[PDB]
Amino acid sequence: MKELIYIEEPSILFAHGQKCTDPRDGLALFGPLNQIYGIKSGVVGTQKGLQIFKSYLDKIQKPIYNHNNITRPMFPGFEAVFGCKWESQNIVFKEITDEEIRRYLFNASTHKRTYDLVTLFNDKIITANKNDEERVDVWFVIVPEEIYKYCAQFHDQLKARLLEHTIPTQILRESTLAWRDFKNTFGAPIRDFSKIEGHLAWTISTAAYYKAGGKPWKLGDIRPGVCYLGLVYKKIEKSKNPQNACCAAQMFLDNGDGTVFKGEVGPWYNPEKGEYHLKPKEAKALLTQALESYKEQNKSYPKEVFIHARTRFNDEEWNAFNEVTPKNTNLVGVTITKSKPLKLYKTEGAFPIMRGNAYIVDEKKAFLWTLGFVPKLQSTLSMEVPNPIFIEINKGEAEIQQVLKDILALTKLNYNACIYADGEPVTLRFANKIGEILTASTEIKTPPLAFKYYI
Amino acid sequence: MKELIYIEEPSILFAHGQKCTDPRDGLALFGPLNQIYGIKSGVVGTQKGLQIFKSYLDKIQKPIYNHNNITRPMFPGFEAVFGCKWESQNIVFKEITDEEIRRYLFNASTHKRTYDLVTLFNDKIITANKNDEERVDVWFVIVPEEIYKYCRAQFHDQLKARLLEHTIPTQILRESTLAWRDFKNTFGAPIRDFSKIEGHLAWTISTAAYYKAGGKPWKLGDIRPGVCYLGLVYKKIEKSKNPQNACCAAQMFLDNGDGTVFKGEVGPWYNPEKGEYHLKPKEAKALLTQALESYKEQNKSYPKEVFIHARTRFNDEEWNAFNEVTPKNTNLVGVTITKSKPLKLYKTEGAFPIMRGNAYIVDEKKAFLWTLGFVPKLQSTLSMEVPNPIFIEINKGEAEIQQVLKDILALTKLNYNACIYADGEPVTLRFANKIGEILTASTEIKTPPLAFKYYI
Amino acid sequence: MRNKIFISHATPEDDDFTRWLSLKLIGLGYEVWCDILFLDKGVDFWSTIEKEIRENTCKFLIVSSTAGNKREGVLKELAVATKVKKHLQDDMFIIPLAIDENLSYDDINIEIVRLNAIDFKKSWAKGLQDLLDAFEKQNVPKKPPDHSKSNLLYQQIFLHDKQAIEKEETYDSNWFPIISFPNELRFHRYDWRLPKQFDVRTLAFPAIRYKEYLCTFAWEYDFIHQLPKTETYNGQESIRISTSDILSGRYDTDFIRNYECQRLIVQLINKAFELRMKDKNVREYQMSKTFAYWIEKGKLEKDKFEKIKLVGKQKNKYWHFGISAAGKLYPSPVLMVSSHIIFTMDGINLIKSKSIQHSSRRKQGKNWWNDKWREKLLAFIRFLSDDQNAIYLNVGSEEKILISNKPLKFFGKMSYVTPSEVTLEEESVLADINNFEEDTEDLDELEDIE
Amino acid sequence: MRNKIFISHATPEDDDFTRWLSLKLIGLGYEVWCDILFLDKGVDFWSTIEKEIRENTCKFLIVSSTAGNKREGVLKELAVATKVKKHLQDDMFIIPLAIDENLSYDDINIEIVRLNAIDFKKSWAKGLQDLLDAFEKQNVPKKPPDHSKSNLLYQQIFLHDKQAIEKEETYDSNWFPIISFPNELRFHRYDWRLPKQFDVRTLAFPAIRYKEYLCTFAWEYDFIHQLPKTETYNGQESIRISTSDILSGRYDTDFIRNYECQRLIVQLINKAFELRMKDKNVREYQMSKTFAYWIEKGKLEKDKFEKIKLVGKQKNKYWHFGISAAGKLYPSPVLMVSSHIIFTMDGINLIKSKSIQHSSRRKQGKNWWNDKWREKLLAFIRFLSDDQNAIYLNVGSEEKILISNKPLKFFGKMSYVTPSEVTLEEESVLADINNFEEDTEDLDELEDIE
RNA sequence: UGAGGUAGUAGGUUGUAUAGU
DNA sequence: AAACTATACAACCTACTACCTCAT
RNA sequence: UGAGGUAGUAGGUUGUAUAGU
DNA sequence: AAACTATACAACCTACTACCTCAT
C-alpha cells in the first residue's frame, strides 16, 4: 500500500545569521542581510500622480494594520522593517501635459500611440538620467487610466528599450494606490483594498528594496559546487518572423542573485518542429555561458548542475551537454508541468492538503504538493483545491528526495511579491518575464544579466 | 595716475539659507544643501589597493588638522562635515590578477598595452554594473607605480570616454595620493609631501566624492533672472593626421551648481590654416538653439540675456547668424579671456602682493581683472611670486564693464574637483579642457550625457 | 540588583506593537518583562506582576493609547508604578509610549502628562533609537546583543497553534482504476468489406481504422446489423494479442509497437466511455477539447442523492455539475475524472456566450470548498455506476469493462490541527486579494451582465 | 556653581537654529541646556526646567520668532527667567536672539524690549561672534579648568579674519611709456635701389620693405656706409607722416591703414630697442619668440645697484637677472617689459640644455618673493639707462626716442593689513603643496640633474 | 599653478607658372 | 592664330593662437 | 493564480505527382 | 527501350506541448 512522504518547510536566512519560515514576520523581526544607506526615488507623471505618490509614500511611513496578523501581518513601517531611509523630500519629478495627449489620441493606429507614449516616457527618463546631477536609484512611473481604457504590453517594451542603459524602474497604476476615490458607476471600489493595505505596503516595500541594491533574504542549505539551471522554454510568437526557440536560462549559485544570460535565437527547428531538441553548438554555448559565469563568480568548478525545464530531453542534446562538462561533474534534467491532473480530496473537514506532501510513483517520476494549507499562516494560498506539479527526471543519477526538497526550497525565493510561496519555482516564474522582456526587442545584442531591470 | 576699482567677493549659498565666502570654512560650519543618505564605494585593484584604501578611509573618518588653518581649514571628520556615512564595510571589490598584466606588459607596443588595460578595466566594471546586485555609486580605480611609470594617449581620458556611453561615475586615484607614508625614493624624502596637508587631501577627495555622489555642495549667491553663462571651449583635437579643424564645445551655468554640457560638432569646416576658431552659421544656429531649448527645459521660460565666454576673438557673420535665432527681446554678449598678456603690478611697500578683486578699466568694452592674488579671508596668496591678471574683452554687444567683471569674479568660485578658495580662470573655461579632451578622445560617442559627474 | 524592563499596555490591543518592542528589546540585549511572552494562561497574574515591579524592575514603560487610558488594569499598574517610583525617589522610572496619532495630549492621565511621552506616532525606528540612547544615558546594565535567544523565544511562544502535528489523515483522489480489462484485442482485416468514406465514429461500438486492419473489442458478428457485407467475413483472418503482455511491457512486435498498443488501448477506452455514457441519456455540452456532460434538473429526486447536493439555482440561473473522463495508464490502469460545472438559464438550453459561463463558474467557485467538491464527485460517480461497486460499461455485446465507483484513497503521516471557521472567510479574503493583484479587460463583460 | 546656557525656542520651529547654536556652543567648550538635545522625550520638563533655571543656569537665551512669539513655554520660561534675574541681580542675564525678519520690534513681548538683540538675522557667523563678544559669555569658555582648549582656540583665535578693510596703497607696474614720440615716420620708395637679395636684418636703423617703400624712422641720407647707391635718390620722393594722426586714428589713406600704421610703428620701435640695447654691450640668451638678455660677471660692482642685488650664486650655478621688452599702443604709447632670469655654470657660457634651465628656475622660484622681484627689475631698468628720467634710443643719427624709465604707478582704494613674515613661510609651504599635488614624468630629469 | 618650450599661423610681403583682351 | 603684361593661386616674412613639459 | 478558451502539432495514417531500370 | 509498383516524402488522424485571458 502506498503512502505520501513529507518534505520539511525550508528555511530562509535573515540578518545576523537567523532563519525563519515566513518572510513577512522575519522582515518585521530581524531585517535584511546587507544594508543600504537609502534610496532617492524619482517619479514621472502628472501632478495628480505626484500628489498620490506623496500621499502613499507618506501613509506607508505610518504603521498600517490588517484585520489579523495570522495571515496578513502588520506593517511596522519602512524604516522599522528595512533599516533604510525614505521621505517626501529629494524627489525628482517630470511632468506631462494633456494637450499633446488629447491631440494625438484621435489617431487610427493604437500601436502608434503605444510607441510614441512609451518613447515619451523613455526619453524623459533617459534625459533625466543623462543631464541631471541628483542620483536616482528607482524611477516610479504613474499611468493615467484614460490610456489604459482607450488604448503590445506597456511595461514590456518600456523595460526592453530601457534595458540598453541599465536603469531600474517600476510601474504603478493610478487605481492601485489611489483606490479611495477610484470607484465604478455603481459606487463601490472595484480595486478594493479595505483590508489588504498591509499586503500592498509589503509588496511595494520588498520590490523597492530589491531594486535598491540590497538583498532581503537568501537560502541557507548550499552544498559546495551546485548550480540550478532553470531553462526558459517560453515561446516567442512574433508571427512570420521565425520564432523557432528563444530559450533563456536562470541560475542560482550562492545567494538569491539571478544571473540570466541571453540564449541564442536558435534557427534550429522552426516551429513546425517545436520538440525543443537543442543542437550541439547552441547547447554548448549555453552551458559554457553558465560554467564560465560560475567560474567568474565562485572561482571553483561546479560539482553538479541541475537543469529545470518544461519539456522532455532527448539523447543527442544530452550527449552534446556532457562533453563540454568535465569528467568529474554530474548533470541532471528536471521537467515541471501543470497540465497533468491529479487532485487529492480530503475526507473530513473543509481544508486542503498541506504544503510539503510528496507522491512518488517511480524513481524517475514523482509529484509534489507545493500549494495548500500552511500551518504557520493557518490558511491556504491556493483557491478551491490545490493542483500539484508533475516532476520527472530524464536521465542522470540523483536522489528523488533531493530534487523534491530542492524545488520546494526554490519555490520561496520570489522577490517581486511578498507572499509565502507560489506554485511554480521562481526560476520558471522569472522565465516568462525574462522571455517577454528580452524578445520584445530584437535590437539588443548584450543584455544585462541582473534582475532589477526586469521585474 | 589712475585707479583700480574694487569688486566685492560674491558669496556662495549654503544650507539653511546661509552664505560664507570660504567653501571650506562654510562646509565645516553649516553644511551642504541636499543631504545624501550615503555612498557605496567599489574598488578595482590589488590587495595592497584594498589595504591602502581602507586605511585611508578609516583615517579620514576621524578629524585631522594641518600645520595651520590659515590656508586649509580644519577637517572635522567626514560625518561631521557632510552628514552622510561612508565606512569600511559594504565595499565592492573586483579582482585584478598581476599575472595577466605582467604577461601583457612584455609586448613591444605600449599602445596595445594601454588598449588591453583600458579594455580590462572597462570589462571589469561593466560586468560589475550589468549583473551584480549591490548598488555601486562611485568607482574608485587605483593604479600602482609600475603601471603608471612603465606604460608612459593617457589612461584617464580614454577610460572616461569609453565609459561615457554607459553613464557610470568613476574616480581615478593614484597610489601616490593616499599612501605617502611609504612612497619613498632612494634619498628618503617622500615624493608626495602630503604630511602637512592631510586636511587638504581629505577635503579635496571628500568634496570630489560628494559631488560624484549626487549632492550639490554649494550654489551661487545672486543670479539675475533670465541670465545664462556659456563658456565656448575650443579644445584643439590633436589625433594625428586626420582632417582636423576644431571641436568647440560649451558649458552652461544658469540657476544652479550643475552644468548642462553638450557635445559640439566634429568640425569638418574651417581648417587650421584659417584656424581662427569660428562657427559656421549652421553650427552657430545649432549651438544657440541647443542653449535656448536647454534653458526652456530646465527653467520653463525664455532667457533675457545670454553670455558667451571664449579665449579667441569673434566676428560679424557668426554674430548675424546668431542673432537670427534669438528672440528680439534678448541681448547677446561675447567675452574673451586671455592669460598671456604681461602686466605685473608690483607693490612699493608691504608684505604681500596685489590682492584679488582689484580690476583695471581702460575702456567700456574691455578691461583687466585680477582673479588671482591675496584675499583677506584666507590670509595667504593662492599664487606664487607675483600674480598675473586676466584680460577681459567684450568684442560685440552693449553692456556694463562692471557687470561682466562681477559675473566673472562670481563664476571663478565653482571648482568641484578641488576644494580651493579660487582659481585663475573661470570654471566655465577650467572645465572646458577636460570636457574637450574627454569628448575628443573616443570616436564612438554620438549623444553624450550632459551631467558633469562622468567627466571630472 | 534590578535589570528587568517592564512594559504595561492593552494585551488584546497593543499586542502587535508590544510583541515587536519586546522581541527587539530581547534581541538587542535588554531583558524585558511583558504579559505576552510570559503571562500565558493558567497562572495567578497580579502577585507576580507586583513582585516583579517592586523587586527587580529598573524601568517602566506604559503605552499611552486610546485604549490605554481607560482600562482598569493599566491604571492599577501605573498606580503601583507610581508607588514604587516614589519609594526609589527616582523620576526616571515611568517612560511613557504614545503610539496613536488620534490621541491628543490633553486627554492623557495626570501621571503621564508631567513626563513627555516618547513619540511612536509617525515612525517607530527612531522611536526605538531614542529609547535605546535614553536607556544607555540612564546607565542600565546591558547584555551583549544575542538575537539567537529572540529566535528561541519566538519559536517557543508565537508558533504554538501554527505548527504541524504528527497524526494520520486519510485522503481520497479523483483516480478510478479498472479492475477488469478485456484479455485480448480483435484486429479485423476487413479490407474491401468497408467503404472508403466510412467514419468510424458512427458505429455502435469502439473501433479504429488501422492500415489494413480494424481494431475493436467485439467479435465480427457485432457489425452485422449495420454492414450487410460483413456476413461473408471469416474470423480466422483476425489476430489476437493478449493484453497482459501489453500492460506488463513485454510485447514489442514489428507490426504494432508497445507505445501504439497502449495508444490504441486508451483510444478504445476513451470512446467506450463516450458511447457508454451516451447510452445513459445524460445531456452533452460542447467543450473545447474534451466532451463535457451534465444532468438535467427534474430527474433526480428532491435534487438529492444519499443526502448530497448536486444541482441548484443561485440568481435566476440553474447551474449543473458534470465530469469529464480521459483514460491514462502510465502509472497504473486508472480512469481519470475531472469536474466542471455548467450553467443553464431555463434548465434546457445553454448560454450563448462562453464569457458568461466562465464568469458564472468563477463567481460560484468561492462559495464552497473541497468538502462540497468531494461530495459532488462521489455523488456523480455513484450515479454513473449503474452497478454498486463499479460501472457496467457498454463496449461489447459480451466483453465489458468494469471500473469501480470508489476512488483510490491514500493516507498521510503528518497533518495539522483543525481550527474554527474564520479561515474560510479569510480564504474568501484571499480571493479578494487575487482580485486586487490582477485584472484585465473586465469592463465590457461586467457591463454586459445586466 | 552656575555655568549652563539656556536656549528657549518654539518646540517645533527654529529647531535647526536652536540645535545649531546649541551644538556649536557645546563644541566651543560651553555647557548649554536645550529642549531638543538634553530634554529628550521620556523625561519631565517643568520641574527640571525650574531646577536648572533656579540652580544651574548662568545665561538665558530666547529665540524670538513669530512661531515662538506666542508659544506658551517660551513666555513661561521668560517669566521664570525674569524672576531669577531679579533674584541673582544680573541685568544682562537674558540675551535675546532674533531670527525672523518679518516681525517688527513691538510685536515681541515687552520683556525683550528692554534689552539689546544679537543680530542673527542676515547670517549666523557674525551673530555667533557677537554672542561670543558678550560679557559673562566671553571668548573664555566656561572658565576652562583642565584641557580641550587646543581645538577651540584652533577654531576661534586662529581663524579670526573674515571681512575686508579699506586703506590706500601705491603699486608700480612693469610698463614704461614713451615720452616724446618722433614727429615723422619716414617711407623710402627705393624701388630699384633696393637689391632683391638684400636683407632688412643687416641695416643699423629700423626699416620695413613696404611694397616698394622702405618705412624707416630717420633720414634717407644715413645709410651711405652700406650702399653707395643712395646719393642718386632725392628726398622729395620720400613721403612723411605725422604720428599724431596715426596715434589718434585720424590718418585714413589707401596707402597704409591706421592699424597697419600702428603695426609698422610697433615693429620699428621693437627693432630700435634691441639695436640700442645691443649697442650697450649686454649679453644675449635665445628664447622661443623673443630674446633674453643678462648681465655678465665683472661689470656690476659689489652686487649692488641702488642698494639692490642683481647677480648671485647658489650651489654651483650663477644666476643672472634679465628682461625682454615688447611695446604696444592701444591703451597708451607704452612699452612693456617682462621679467626673466637666466643661469650659467661659470659666468662665461650658458647651460647647454633648456630643461636644466627650467628646472633650476623653478628651484629658484621659492627662494625669493615679490619685493626682490621688483628690486631686481627696477635696478635693471636704472642700469640700462644713462640719464635719470628716460632712456636714450639710438634710432637715428639725429632723432632719439625717449621712453619713461620710471614704471607707471597706480593707487588702490581698498587694501589689506600687513601681517608678520610667517606667511611668507606659509607661501613657500604652499609652493611645496603645489609640489605635492601636480607632478608628471619628473623622475628622469631629477635623476639626470646630479 | 606659471613660466619657458616647440609648431606654426593672425594678416600683409613678393616668388612660382600660367592666360586676359 | 599670337602680341604685352597683368593674372592665379600661393609659398613664405615677422609675428599670435594653441598643446605638451617641469617643477616648487 | 487557476480553470476555461484556443491554435497547432508530436508521430506515424494514406493521398498528391512522379520515374526507376 | 520498357514490364510492375512501390517510391519519397507528405497531407493529415486522434490527441500532446506551450500560449492567454476572465475574473474570484
PDB file of N, CA and C in Angstrom, chain A residues 406-454:
ATOM      1  N   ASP A 406      14.759  20.305  -3.166  1.00  0.00           N
ATOM      2  CA  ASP A 406      15.420  21.423  -3.825  1.00  0.00           C
ATOM      3  C   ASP A 406      14.418  22.333  -4.522  1.00  0.00           C
ATOM      4  N   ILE A 407      13.435  21.763  -5.227  1.00  0.00           N
ATOM      5  CA  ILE A 407      12.436  22.621  -5.864  1.00  0.00           C
ATOM      6  C   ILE A 407      11.549  23.263  -4.801  1.00  0.00           C
ATOM      7  N   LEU A 408      11.270  22.540  -3.707  1.00  0.00           N
ATOM      8  CA  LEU A 408      10.494  23.136  -2.623  1.00  0.00           C
ATOM      9  C   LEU A 408      11.235  24.306  -1.981  1.00  0.00           C
ATOM     10  N   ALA A 409      12.560  24.203  -1.857  1.00  0.00           N
ATOM     11  CA  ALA A 409      13.342  25.333  -1.365  1.00  0.00           C
ATOM     12  C   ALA A 409      13.367  26.468  -2.379  1.00  0.00           C
ATOM     13  N   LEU A 410      13.426  26.132  -3.668  1.00  0.00           N
ATOM     14  CA  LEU A 410      13.472  27.145  -4.711  1.00  0.00           C
ATOM     15  C   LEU A 410      12.156  27.894  -4.859  1.00  0.00           C
ATOM     16  N   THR A 411      11.047  27.327  -4.379  1.00  0.00           N
ATOM     17  CA  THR A 411       9.748  27.971  -4.553  1.00  0.00           C
ATOM     18  C   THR A 411       9.598  29.258  -3.749  1.00  0.00           C
ATOM     19  N   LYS A 412      10.403  29.460  -2.712  1.00  0.00           N
ATOM     20  CA  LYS A 412      10.176  30.551  -1.772  1.00  0.00           C
ATOM     21  C   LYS A 412      11.026  31.787  -2.046  1.00  0.00           C
ATOM     22  N   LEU A 413      11.732  31.845  -3.171  1.00  0.00           N
ATOM     23  CA  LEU A 413      12.630  32.961  -3.467  1.00  0.00           C
ATOM     24  C   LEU A 413      12.011  33.957  -4.436  1.00  0.00           C
ATOM     25  N   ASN A 414      10.704  34.172  -4.348  1.00  0.00           N
ATOM     26  CA  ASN A 414      10.062  35.199  -5.153  1.00  0.00           C
ATOM     27  C   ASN A 414      10.386  36.572  -4.582  1.00  0.00           C
ATOM     28  N   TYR A 415      10.881  37.468  -5.432  1.00  0.00           N
ATOM     29  CA  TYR A 415      11.289  38.793  -4.988  1.00  0.00           C
ATOM     30  C   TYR A 415      10.333  39.904  -5.391  1.00  0.00           C
ATOM     31  N   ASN A 416       9.545  39.717  -6.452  1.00  0.00           N
ATOM     32  CA  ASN A 416       8.582  40.744  -6.837  1.00  0.00           C
ATOM     33  C   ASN A 416       7.429  40.830  -5.849  1.00  0.00           C
ATOM     34  N   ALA A 417       7.060  39.714  -5.229  1.00  0.00           N
ATOM     35  CA  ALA A 417       5.910  39.658  -4.341  1.00  0.00           C
ATOM     36  C   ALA A 417       6.337  39.168  -2.966  1.00  0.00           C
ATOM     37  N   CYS A 418       5.748  39.763  -1.930  1.00  0.00           N
ATOM     38  CA  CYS A 418       5.989  39.340  -0.553  1.00  0.00           C
ATOM     39  C   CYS A 418       4.877  38.386  -0.123  1.00  0.00           C
ATOM     40  N   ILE A 419       4.884  37.217  -0.750  1.00  0.00           N
ATOM     41  CA  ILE A 419       3.936  36.159  -0.447  1.00  0.00           C
ATOM     42  C   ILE A 419       4.709  34.999   0.166  1.00  0.00           C
ATOM     43  N   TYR A 420       3.974  34.095   0.817  1.00  0.00           N
ATOM     44  CA  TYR A 420       4.611  32.956   1.468  1.00  0.00           C
ATOM     45  C   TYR A 420       5.242  32.018   0.447  1.00  0.00           C
ATOM     46  N   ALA A 421       4.486  31.628  -0.578  1.00  0.00           N
ATOM     47  CA  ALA A 421       5.015  30.789  -1.643  1.00  0.00           C
ATOM     48  C   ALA A 421       4.120  30.910  -2.866  1.00  0.00           C
ATOM     49  N   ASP A 422       4.683  30.560  -4.016  1.00  0.00           N
ATOM     50  CA  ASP A 422       3.944  30.409  -5.260  1.00  0.00           C
ATOM     51  C   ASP A 422       3.995  28.952  -5.695  1.00  0.00           C
ATOM     52  N   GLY A 423       3.198  28.624  -6.705  1.00  0.00           N
ATOM     53  CA  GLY A 423       3.172  27.272  -7.220  1.00  0.00           C
ATOM     54  C   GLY A 423       4.451  26.883  -7.929  1.00  0.00           C
ATOM     55  N   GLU A 424       4.721  27.526  -9.059  1.00  0.00           N
ATOM     56  CA  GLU A 424       5.883  27.175  -9.850  1.00  0.00           C
ATOM     57  C   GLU A 424       7.157  27.696  -9.188  1.00  0.00           C
ATOM     58  N   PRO A 425       8.283  27.006  -9.382  1.00  0.00           N
ATOM     59  CA  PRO A 425       9.558  27.517  -8.867  1.00  0.00           C
ATOM     60  C   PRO A 425       9.927  28.844  -9.512  1.00  0.00           C
ATOM     61  N   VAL A 426      10.666  29.657  -8.753  1.00  0.00           N
ATOM     62  CA  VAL A 426      10.917  31.037  -9.143  1.00  0.00           C
ATOM     63  C   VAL A 426      11.820  31.148 -10.363  1.00  0.00           C
ATOM     64  N   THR A 427      12.592  30.107 -10.684  1.00  0.00           N
ATOM     65  CA  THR A 427      13.336  30.109 -11.939  1.00  0.00           C
ATOM     66  C   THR A 427      12.380  30.104 -13.126  1.00  0.00           C
ATOM     67  N   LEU A 428      11.403  29.200 -13.106  1.00  0.00           N
ATOM     68  CA  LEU A 428      10.389  29.174 -14.149  1.00  0.00           C
ATOM     69  C   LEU A 428       9.436  30.358 -14.060  1.00  0.00           C
ATOM     70  N   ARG A 429       9.325  30.999 -12.895  1.00  0.00           N
ATOM     71  CA  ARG A 429       8.499  32.199 -12.803  1.00  0.00           C
ATOM     72  C   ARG A 429       9.194  33.391 -13.450  1.00  0.00           C
ATOM     73  N   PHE A 430      10.496  33.549 -13.207  1.00  0.00           N
ATOM     74  CA  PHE A 430      11.254  34.600 -13.873  1.00  0.00           C
ATOM     75  C   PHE A 430      11.511  34.275 -15.337  1.00  0.00           C
ATOM     76  N   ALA A 431      11.309  33.013 -15.729  1.00  0.00           N
ATOM     77  CA  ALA A 431      11.438  32.604 -17.125  1.00  0.00           C
ATOM     78  C   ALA A 431      10.522  33.404 -18.039  1.00  0.00           C
ATOM     79  N   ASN A 432       9.236  33.478 -17.691  1.00  0.00           N
ATOM     80  CA  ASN A 432       8.270  34.170 -18.537  1.00  0.00           C
ATOM     81  C   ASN A 432       8.595  35.652 -18.650  1.00  0.00           C
ATOM     82  N   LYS A 433       8.955  36.284 -17.533  1.00  0.00           N
ATOM     83  CA  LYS A 433       9.253  37.711 -17.555  1.00  0.00           C
ATOM     84  C   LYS A 433      10.515  38.003 -18.354  1.00  0.00           C
ATOM     85  N   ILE A 434      11.565  37.196 -18.169  1.00  0.00           N
ATOM     86  CA  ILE A 434      12.801  37.420 -18.908  1.00  0.00           C
ATOM     87  C   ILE A 434      12.579  37.186 -20.400  1.00  0.00           C
ATOM     88  N   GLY A 435      11.755  36.195 -20.759  1.00  0.00           N
ATOM     89  CA  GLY A 435      11.466  35.961 -22.162  1.00  0.00           C
ATOM     90  C   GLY A 435      10.658  37.080 -22.782  1.00  0.00           C
ATOM     91  N   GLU A 436       9.627  37.546 -22.075  1.00  0.00           N
ATOM     92  CA  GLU A 436       8.778  38.603 -22.611  1.00  0.00           C
ATOM     93  C   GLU A 436       9.552  39.901 -22.778  1.00  0.00           C
ATOM     94  N   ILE A 437      10.413  40.233 -21.814  1.00  0.00           N
ATOM     95  CA  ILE A 437      11.196  41.458 -21.934  1.00  0.00           C
ATOM     96  C   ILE A 437      12.251  41.318 -23.024  1.00  0.00           C
ATOM     97  N   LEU A 438      12.923  40.170 -23.084  1.00  0.00           N
ATOM     98  CA  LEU A 438      14.063  40.014 -23.967  1.00  0.00           C
ATOM     99  C   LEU A 438      13.668  39.811 -25.424  1.00  0.00           C
ATOM    100  N   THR A 439      12.475  39.279 -25.698  1.00  0.00           N
ATOM    101  CA  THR A 439      12.001  39.132 -27.069  1.00  0.00           C
ATOM    102  C   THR A 439      10.898  40.124 -27.421  1.00  0.00           C
ATOM    103  N   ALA A 440      10.829  41.249 -26.716  1.00  0.00           N
ATOM    104  CA  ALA A 440      10.039  42.382 -27.170  1.00  0.00           C
ATOM    105  C   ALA A 440      10.849  43.345 -28.026  1.00  0.00           C
ATOM    106  N   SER A 441      12.161  43.136 -28.132  1.00  0.00           N
ATOM    107  CA  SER A 441      13.024  43.980 -28.955  1.00  0.00           C
ATOM    108  C   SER A 441      14.233  43.154 -29.371  1.00  0.00           C
ATOM    109  N   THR A 442      14.328  42.856 -30.667  1.00  0.00           N
ATOM    110  CA  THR A 442      15.439  42.086 -31.210  1.00  0.00           C
ATOM    111  C   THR A 442      16.735  42.891 -31.227  1.00  0.00           C
ATOM    112  N   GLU A 443      16.636  44.213 -31.255  1.00  0.00           N
ATOM    113  CA  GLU A 443      17.706  45.190 -31.449  1.00  0.00           C
ATOM    114  C   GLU A 443      18.748  45.213 -30.324  1.00  0.00           C
ATOM    115  N   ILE A 444      18.770  44.307 -29.350  1.00  0.00           N
ATOM    116  CA  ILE A 444      19.775  44.302 -28.293  1.00  0.00           C
ATOM    117  C   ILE A 444      20.643  43.062 -28.446  1.00  0.00           C
ATOM    118  N   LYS A 445      21.954  43.238 -28.288  1.00  0.00           N
ATOM    119  CA  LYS A 445      22.908  42.160 -28.505  1.00  0.00           C
ATOM    120  C   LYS A 445      23.627  41.702 -27.246  1.00  0.00           C
ATOM    121  N   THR A 446      23.824  42.576 -26.263  1.00  0.00           N
ATOM    122  CA  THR A 446      24.447  42.210 -24.990  1.00  0.00           C
ATOM    123  C   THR A 446      23.577  42.736 -23.859  1.00  0.00           C
ATOM    124  N   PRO A 447      22.527  42.009 -23.492  1.00  0.00           N
ATOM    125  CA  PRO A 447      21.631  42.481 -22.438  1.00  0.00           C
ATOM    126  C   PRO A 447      22.247  42.274 -21.067  1.00  0.00           C
ATOM    127  N   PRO A 448      21.866  43.085 -20.083  1.00  0.00           N
ATOM    128  CA  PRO A 448      22.352  42.866 -18.718  1.00  0.00           C
ATOM    129  C   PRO A 448      21.806  41.578 -18.131  1.00  0.00           C
ATOM    130  N   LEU A 449      22.547  41.038 -17.169  1.00  0.00           N
ATOM    131  CA  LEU A 449      22.237  39.743 -16.583  1.00  0.00           C
ATOM    132  C   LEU A 449      21.610  39.859 -15.200  1.00  0.00           C
ATOM    133  N   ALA A 450      21.329  41.071 -14.734  1.00  0.00           N
ATOM    134  CA  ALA A 450      20.795  41.275 -13.397  1.00  0.00           C
ATOM    135  C   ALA A 450      19.283  41.065 -13.403  1.00  0.00           C
ATOM    136  N   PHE A 451      18.631  41.380 -12.285  1.00  0.00           N
ATOM    137  CA  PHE A 451      17.198  41.180 -12.133  1.00  0.00           C
ATOM    138  C   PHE A 451      16.407  42.450 -11.885  1.00  0.00           C
ATOM    139  N   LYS A 452      17.034  43.504 -11.360  1.00  0.00           N
ATOM    140  CA  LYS A 452      16.312  44.724 -11.025  1.00  0.00           C
ATOM    141  C   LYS A 452      15.766  45.438 -12.253  1.00  0.00           C
ATOM    142  N   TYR A 453      16.341  45.193 -13.426  1.00  0.00           N
ATOM    143  CA  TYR A 453      15.918  45.844 -14.655  1.00  0.00           C
ATOM    144  C   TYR A 453      14.810  45.085 -15.373  1.00  0.00           C
ATOM    145  N   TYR A 454      14.266  44.037 -14.759  1.00  0.00           N
ATOM    146  CA  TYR A 454      13.244  43.212 -15.390  1.00  0.00           C
ATOM    147  C   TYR A 454      11.938  43.173 -14.610  1.00  0.00           C
TER     148      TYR A 454
END
